[PDB]
Symmetry: C3
Subunit: 148 residues, 3 copies
């Protein structure tokens, strides 16, 4: 009950964009964890389980798309952010499939691992094309950190 912990979820009112929120009944932001500029900030050096899930959805396949989901680590002294976890998905074929009344496709991605972080480190969980995010139902898009 003293361990820094966070489980933030996507703001469902901002379609086509990814904004993390703690103000939801089954979300958490406690024991030192801060959420600033859409990133989770760790309060102390230590081992942390970092995870995130996104759900993508699309109707038809007019475009061949490469979907990515990445959890990164950043500290002021860094040249740039570094990938901690990442995955890619390709829901559609190059050829635009024939026919109207398109059935939607759905693609989830889950990332998660243990990392030694330092006080003040900023963790981000982002997607390359947030226009395909699906957060119509709760529990589909989230980002968490838990001190071990």
């Amino acid at each position: 009950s003293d361990k820094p912990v966070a489980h933030v979820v996507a703001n469902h009112q901002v379609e086509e964009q990814l904004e993390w929120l703690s103000q939801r009944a089954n979300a958490l932001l406690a024991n030192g964890m801060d959420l600033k500029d859409n990133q989770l900030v760790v309060p102390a050096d230590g081992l942390y389980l970092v995870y995130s899930q996104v759900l993508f959805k699309g109707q038809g396949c007019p475009d061949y798309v490469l979907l990515t989901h990445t959890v990164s680590r950043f500290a002021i002294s860094y040249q740039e952010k570094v990938n901690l976890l990442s995955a890619v998905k390709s829901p559609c074929p190059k050829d635009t499939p024939e026919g109207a009344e398109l059935k939607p496709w759905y693609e989830p991605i889950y990332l998660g691992g243990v990392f030694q972080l330092e006080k003040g480190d900023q963790l981000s969980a982002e997607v390359n094309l947030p226009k395909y995010l699906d957060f119509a139902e709760s529990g589909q898009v989230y980002f968490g950190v838990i001190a071990l």
Copy 2:
């Protein structure tokens, strides 16, 4: 060691149904965790890592199918079921066949997050269409809850 812990797996004997079991090699149900009416019950207020994986399999694509996997919380206080984690998958883009070969397809879904739960809360891990679940091998369908 003395923290409530559970890692239950699907019963492989009955097809088209999702029944969690603790009586298997590499399964767990200890330190207060209980399995009742196919749900994991936590023994106390506190932080818990909750996760689950399901594997779906189908013989070709006779028609469009929408697969969902959801971990929900039934709050002993509130008296209602809320989804904590959820994902969707569409394994059948088009009904390709039309006399063609019905090749099997496979689709896994993983869910996991940390949540503040209350004593007596009941957690369920379910899918919408259990007819597509695949238990052929061990380690494919599971549900865990671990006290932090």
Copy 3:
């Protein structure tokens, strides 16, 4: 004492094979965890969170392939591998729909769960077809174990 922990990543310099590395940034192998013969060895009896992710990529679908990812337990009392976690994915059809497709497909698989293990147990995270693994970016392929 301090928790045995490991988070190893795939060697990106060896294409078509899965070699776990620990001497990289954002990788861990400490407090008694050992990496031997590409397997993670636990130093004591206890509960451990074990997880792994792989990312597969292919182009054109000339062969109908079933991709598998499995985390196994090998005991020095039961000299044979047992599945702890496993999943299967089918990224292709027997051959391209018409003529020959040309866009690359991508498929990630995540596995994770808590297990009671014994001192000396060796954990392996392997795929059936490593030729399809993609290490083009950091954080795509990993294997971790952390003592609870």
